[PDB]
Every structure is written in C-alpha cells, then in structure tokens.
Design a protein around this nucleic acid. Sequence first.
DNA 1: TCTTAAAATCGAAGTTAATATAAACTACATAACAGACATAAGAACAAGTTACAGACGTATTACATAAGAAAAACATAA
Length: 110
Amino acid sequence: MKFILAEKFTFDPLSNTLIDKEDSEEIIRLGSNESRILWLLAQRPNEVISRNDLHDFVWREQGFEVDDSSLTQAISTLRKMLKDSTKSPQYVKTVPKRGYQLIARVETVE
DNA sequence: TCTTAAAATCGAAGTTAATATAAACTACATAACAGACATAAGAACAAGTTACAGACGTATTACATAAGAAAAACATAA
C-alpha cells in the first residue's frame, strides 16, 4: 500500500521510494532505517510514539542492537532529505520526554 | 417760767419648741376626676452599600537537571 504525506510526497513501505509532486522527475532515495521509521510513524497516524518502542521495533527486527544516537541521526537525515523545517512543526517533530511526532497527512493510495 | 403728761431705756452669751368658748335651705355655675382616642416619639428587625482585611492565588525572577544537537578527535580502509 502506497502512502501520501501532506498531499505532497508519496512513499511506499515496500520499495522505499519518495516522489515529490512538485518535482515528479526527481525520485528521492532514502535509507532503509529512516524509511522504516517514517512508515512506523505513518502506521500510527498523528499520536506520540515512544523513542524506546520505535527504536526497538525498528532495529531489533533487524537482528542487531545499536545505540540511541542512531535514531537521532536517522531522524536528522529524514528531516533534512524531506526538506522539512529545521525546528518548526511542519511534517515531523520531536516531543521531549515523550517521543516523536508526525504532522503530514496520511493518504493511502491502495 | 413753772407743772404735767408723753417718750424712751434698762449686759452678754446659753437656753428657749403651740393651743384648746362661741342657722338653714335652694338654685346655679364652675372646677375636678375619670375614660378613651389619636399622635408624636421610640424601639426592634431586616436590608443596601461601601470598604478594608486575610489569606490564597497569579506573575516576575533566578535556576537544576536531563535530553538533544553540533563539533572535534580518533581509528580504519583505500
């Protein structure tokens, strides 16, 4: 099932591709970790998910354990490549002591 | 001017506490006493208002600590 974010971006959890409607010619390439994080965020529309729970769901299924700086770096790359605002709540933000939040709308293509 | 009648005086204090006999009836107007009512003064209960106090609740100020991000240094592979 393909998902649409904020009526602008399109992404699929199965092939890890990003398409911007403003520039449909340029496909945006994302890493597996950040793509899985964004898909986990999209699976729970617009409510807080824990850093601990999201981290353990993303990386223990991978079979290997990493430190918590990895999640922060992955989110930094996600915000940078999506060209989301540096600290304003436009698409993805961080809620301290509670976890991570998404603002972009969810539109399932199929 | 020589009798002769009036007039006046006669110690202080202290004490010193009443008497005491002797026409009737009628008519009228006025004052006084008693009862009741209304009025001015008074008291009690409740309400409005205007303010100040008392402790609680708000905003100004100075931070402790922990999560997140940037950066410098290090180890490793080409």
